[PDB]
Amino acid sequence: PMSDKIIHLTDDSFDTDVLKADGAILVDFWAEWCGPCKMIAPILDEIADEYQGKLTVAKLNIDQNPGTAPKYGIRGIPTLLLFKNGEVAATKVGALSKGQLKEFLDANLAGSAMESTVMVLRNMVDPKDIDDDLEGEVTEECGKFGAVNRVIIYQEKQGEEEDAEIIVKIFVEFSIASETHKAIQALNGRWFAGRKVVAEVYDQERFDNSDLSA
Amino acid sequence: DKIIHLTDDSFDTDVLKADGAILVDFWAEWCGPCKMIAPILDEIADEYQGKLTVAKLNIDQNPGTAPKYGIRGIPTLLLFKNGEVAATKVGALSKGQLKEFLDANLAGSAMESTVMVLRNMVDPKDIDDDLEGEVTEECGKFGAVNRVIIYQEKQGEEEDAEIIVKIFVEFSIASETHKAIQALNGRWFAGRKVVAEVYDQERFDNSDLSA
Numbered sequence: 433p434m435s436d437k438i439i440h441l442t443d444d445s446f447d448t449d450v451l452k453a454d455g456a457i458l459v460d461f462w463a464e465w466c467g468p469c470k471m472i473a474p475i476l477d478e479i480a481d482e483y484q485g486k487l488t489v490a491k492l493n494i495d496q497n498p499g500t501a502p503k504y505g506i507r508g509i510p511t512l513l514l515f516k517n518g519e520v521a522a523t524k525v526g527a528l529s530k531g532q533l534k535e536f537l538d539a540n541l542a543g544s545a546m547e548s549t550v551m552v553l554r555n556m557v558d559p560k561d562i563d564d565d566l567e568g569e570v571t572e573e574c575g576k577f578g579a580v581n582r583v584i585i586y587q588e589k590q591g592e593e594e595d596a597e598i599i600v601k602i603f604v605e606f607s608i609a610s611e612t613h614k615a616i617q618a619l620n621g622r623w624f625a626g627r628k629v630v631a632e633v634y635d636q637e638r639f640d641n642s643d644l645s646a
Numbered sequence: 647d648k649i650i651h652l653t654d655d656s657f658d659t660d661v662l663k664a665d666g667a668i669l670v671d672f673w674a675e676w677c678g679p680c681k682m683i684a685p686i687l688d689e690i691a692d693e694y695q696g697k698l699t700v701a702k703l704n705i706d707q708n709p710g711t712a713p714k715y716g717i718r719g720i721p722t723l724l725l726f727k728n729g730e731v732a733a734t735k736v737g738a739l740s741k742g743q744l745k746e747f748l749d750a751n752l753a754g755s756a757m758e759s760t761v762m763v764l765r766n767m768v769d770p771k772d773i774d775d776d777l778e779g780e781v782t783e784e785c786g787k788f789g790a791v792n793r794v795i796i797y798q799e800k801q802g803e804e805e806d807a808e809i810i811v812k813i814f815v816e817f818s819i820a821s822e823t824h825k826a827i828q829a830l831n832g833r834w835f836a837g838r839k840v841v842a843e844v845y846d847q848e849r850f851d852n853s854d855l856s857a
């Protein structure tokens with residue numbers, strides 16, 4: 433109003449400010465002697481104002497805070513790391529125009545936001561517990577929230593190591609998003625049974641395209 | 647040099663427990679676009695031999711597997727690596743677009759890298775200031791070590807998410823890295839069997855340690 437919308441990071445503040453942050457955070461690794469860093473400095477201010485609500489811009493001075501950068505393989509400066517939910521989602525190395533940054537941001541932030549017909553049930557069933565009856569039982573029980581299109585029992589290996597844990601994600605696609613919303617609200621945090629189940633929206637475009645990895 | 651014929655019974659062994667990356671094609675004889683991509687997959691099978699195996703599951707003959715992966719329309723291609731689904735592609739595709747798909751998801755296929763990634767070597771809790779130096783000493787056996795990165799990554803968007811450790815080892819030239827990957831892959835380190843693989847050099851050069 434109109435003050436500074438940039439989060440000014442330290443090594444000590446980085447975890448809370450970036451990794452445990454709400455929404456997408458664009459981290460700028462910089463230094464005062466860095467010419468191209470000052471290039472993008474005013475661009476970052478505009479982006480910070482114009483992406484209010486969908487992006488927070490943060491800066492870490494690598495001279496004053498030398499601990500963080502080497503952990504993320506920062507080489508040249510400036511480097512932009514885009515974080516989403518504690519995850520590095522994208523990177524951009526070096527200076528770039530306002531248009532090039534927007535193009536990079538537009539391509540790496542969620543587009544066509546939408547309430548999904550797809551629910552994902554997590555931490556509900558161990559892979560060994562799966563049998564021929566499970567899909568049918570899920571569709572039957574979720575049918576009290578609305579019309580169930582398809583139920584997918586998905587097993588996911590949580591690593592590349594030979595005996596990495598396999599977990600189960602249960603996907604329930606409803607006919608319309610209103611039904612999915614009721615189901616999620618009713619089921620999330622509830623015990624079925626012995627296990628506390630996470631009920632959650634799952635990206636509809638991903639699901640429609642046979643990507644069950646998220 | 648040729649394509650694996652998958653069945654519902656063989657899938658686990660042929661795909662999930664296989665050595666090297668596997669490109670799985672879900673198809674059927676009446677499927678027009680499936681036949682359109684068949685000669686393309688033949689060429690990919692020959693051209694990417696020793697780096698990728700192509701495999702086909704006829705969904706009429708073998709109806710058990712595809713619904714487990716959320717397959718809807720055909721053809722659908724799934725890229726497997728070490729029992730993980732690395733990437734997915736829905737519908738028909740040109741020789742070039744499939745090569746672009748493979749370049750983006752098959753580490754090393756566009757360029758053999760100076761960078762090795764070590765997976766499953768250590769727990770986050772077992773990291774200390776000694777580790778980086780121990781790795782470079784251990785990897786020095788294979789050549790000049792430019793840089794070792796002990797990278798901690800969150801596995802997923804949800805806060806519950808497990809944190810894992812990826813250890814990046816960049817060598818001076820790709821030949822040294824190849825020696826290192828050969829000698830380290832599948833090796834046991836105090837209770838843990840490690841995965842050593844090429845990591846895309848361009849990702850690494852650009853501080854993309856997420857793959």
Ligand SMILES: [Cl-]
Pocket residue numbers: 440441491492493
């Ligand atoms: Cl600052």
Ligand SMILES: [Cl-]
Pocket residue numbers: 832833834
């Ligand atoms: Cl051994």
